Every structure is written in structure tokens, then in C-alpha cells.
Amino acid sequence: XXXXXXXXXXXXXXXXXXXXXXXXXXXXXXXXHVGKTDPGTVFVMNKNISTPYSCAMHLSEWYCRKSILALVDGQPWDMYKPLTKSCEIKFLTFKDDDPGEVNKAYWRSCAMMMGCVIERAFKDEYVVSLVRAPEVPVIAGAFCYDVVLDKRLDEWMPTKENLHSFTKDARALIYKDLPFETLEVEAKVALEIFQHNKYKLDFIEEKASQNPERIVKLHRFGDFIDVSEGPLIPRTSICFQYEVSAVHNLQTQSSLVRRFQGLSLPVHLRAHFTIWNKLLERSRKMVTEDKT
RNA sequence: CACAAACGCGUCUCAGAGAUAAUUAAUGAUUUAAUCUUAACCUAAUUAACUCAUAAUAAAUCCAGCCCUAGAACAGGGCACA
């Protein structure tokens, strides 16, 4: 499973390098960024596939480190979202009155993150087998990560120490400080990469083919790749803590589905350890609910 | 005593025990048939110091900010954070 993951990561890196090469082949472009977040700001630079986060860096280190999301021409985008021609750049943060976008992005980042973690733990033991299902976001403050496993994992029970170890590895990758990557790829090469995952194949085939856009955004964290229609968390330093609350088993059309669920911590801030235990209980209860 | 504080002039408390002092008082008893608290040896009893069966001590790893009978700073305490 290590050779297949290394070959898939090498094929994804070659496809990302080829797409990036063919898209950035012309390095002559005009990027004008003008808008008022704080009072007015006017800047003009020449680059292709320009990053608004680099403009945040251009302003100062403070607004840079406090940058979470980027509102462009009224449309909310990730800070890694490339800009072209004239654009109006606004900096959206958690403390702002509109938590929704950064919240959704946060939950989708947490789902992805564990998408990597579980896989890495499953790369520790060759006995286990993992197949990723689609993820279900919940605006109630929940996120559900769906997956299916080998029969051996169906026979063997998920002891508490296990999930604790998953949490430890999650925090490990959290303080490892690994930057997220944003790739623009065709549905074809993507289909080829996701061939080993049936649910993702069905996802792309059914949903993405109906969509007029053949350009899909692949978010890469470590050796893990995920499909996202929306913004991602800026860095690994943004997420202070993570926890694994509980799992569920659903039976549909004579098929079994294993759904893992947990919670996340915004703006690197926790009130106390008591309210943390309370957050554990709340987490598990929200897992028992399984909102849809 | 002109705030709810600090004081005595006011009130309360003060304890075993073990061992040895230098004197001094002995038991069976040699060397030296007697005698002898001593040479040996089991052993009876004797100020303060010299010591404790013990009483005070130590859960670091956030503490912004607001307060305190706490306070030079610091330290200590208390305030139902985002």
C-alpha cells in the first residue's frame, strides 16, 4: 500500500506540475488590487496566478498572520484562490460578524485533515483496508466523515485507546506544520487518481460531469488528496487542537457504512479543561444525532 | 480609636519522652581465703546541655485584565474570559 500511495502521489505531483506549467506558461499578466478593508488600499503588480495572501504579506505581517479568508468582488474565496486582472480584496476573519464561511471552511479542513490522519495510521498496519466515502458537512456545527473498511475491521472492535492514538497522531500532524496545497486539475486525470476509491469515482462521475466546469480543485495535504468545492484552512498553525468523538454504522441497500465524527477548535482558543470535557460530551451527543 | 483597620493597658496558650552529667548511693564478686561500687560481667537508682513519639513543610509547567483584611517590586489570595 506504500508503493501505490507513493505512485499515486508521484502521479499527482506530476499532473499538478504539468497543469501548473501549462497554466502559468505565460508569465506576463497585469494584476490590480484595489479596495477598502480598513480604509482604502490601492496596489498594482505584474504576475500570473497571483495570490491574495501574498498581498496580505505585502501589506504587513499582522494582517498576514490574521488572514483567514479573502472576499473578492463580493464573492468569498480562499486565500490561496488565484486572482486575475482587477480585483477588490477584503480580509475576512473569525472575529468578524460573518462566521459562516470560515466555519464551513473549518469543518471541511477538519474532515480532510483526519482524511490524511486515518490513512497514515492505516499505512502503519498493512492488515487494514480503507475506502473513502463522501463527507457530509453540517451547518449545526458538525461534520461527518464517511468511510468503509475491510471485513477484519468489521470483526475487530474500535477500542478507546485506538481513537486516542488517532487523536495523538492528529495533533502530531498538527504541530508538524505542513502547508496545504491547492491544485487545478481536469476531471480525467482526477478520475485516474481516484480510481482506487469507488465512492469518489461515483461522486466525480455523477456530480462533476453535470457541472459545466471541467476544472476541479484538488487539495493536497501530505500524501493525502481531497476534493473540495470551497475554501480551505490557511495553515496547520491555525488549528490548535482536534478530537475523535465517536463512530456510527449505517445499513443501506445491504451495504454497511462507517461514519467517524469529531470537533475542532477555532482561533487557537479554549476556555478551560472543564468546558473541554463538556465539549467532548457535546461532541459525542452531536455524533449520536447524525444530522442530515 | 472620625469609616468595617492597628495595638496592650485587654484576652488565650505554653506539653510528654529517651540517654549520658561529674558528684553520690548499691547488688552477687574476684586479683589479695578477708575486704572492695569495678577489675570482668548480668544488673538498682541520680541537675542543665545532648536528642525525639513528633508538630509547622513541598499538587510547578494558563494567571490578560479586575480586586484584597496581601503587598516596596516580586511573592500570596480572591473575581463563575473570548
Question: Determination method here?
Answer: cryo-EM
Given a contact cutoff of 8 angstroms between Cβ atoms, the answer to whether A182 and A79 are in contact is: no
What's the Å distance between residue A235 CA and nucleotide B10 C1'?
Answer: 72
> What resolution in angstroms, rounded to 1 decimal?
4.9
Q: What is the 3-state secondary structure (H, E, C) of chain A?
A: CHHHHHHHHHHHHHHHHHHHHHHCCCCCCCEEEEEECCCEEEEEECCCCECHHHHHHHHCHHHHHCCCEEEECCEEEECCCCECEEECEEEECCCCCCCHHHHHHHHHHHHHHHHHHHHHHCCCCCCCCEEECCCEEECCCEEEEEEEECHHHHHCCCCHHHHHHHHHHHHHHHHCCCCCEEEEEEHHHHHHHHHHCHHHHHHHHHHHHHCCCCEEEEEEECCEEEECCCCCCCCCCCCCCEEEEEEEEEEECCEEEEEEEEEECHHHCCCCCHHHHHHHHHHHHHHHHCCC
| Direct distance between the N- and C-terminal alpha carbons of chain A, in angstroms, rounded to an integer | 33
Cell readout for A45 is 503588480
Q: What is the DSSP letter of A74?
A: T
Cell readout for A107 is 469543518
Which amino acid would we find at residue A268?
A: H
- At residue A177, the 3 state secondary structure works out as coil
Q: Which nucleotide is nearest to A270 (CA to C1')?
A: B82
CA A246 to chain centre: 20
The residues with which A251 forms a beta bridge, in sequence order, are A256
Which amino acid would we find at residue A171?
A: R
Which amino acid would we find at residue A9?
A: X
Q: Which nucleotide is nearest to A267 (CA to C1')?
A: B82
Given a contact cutoff of 8 angstroms between Cβ atoms, the answer to whether A96 and A76 are in contact is: no
The residues with which A138 forms a beta bridge, in sequence order, are A142
What's the Å distance between residue A7 CA and nucleotide B15 C1'?
Answer: 85
How far is CA A47 from each of CA A22, A29, A43, A89, A217, rounded to the nearest angstrom? 15, 5, 13, 16, 21
Footprint of strand B on the protein (CB under 7 A): A 269, 271
What's the Å distance between residue A279 CA and nucleotide B69 C1'?
Answer: 40
Given a contact cutoff of 8 angstroms between Cβ atoms, the answer to whether A50 and A31 are in contact is: yes
Given a contact cutoff of 8 angstroms between Cβ atoms, the answer to whether A59 and A91 are in contact is: no
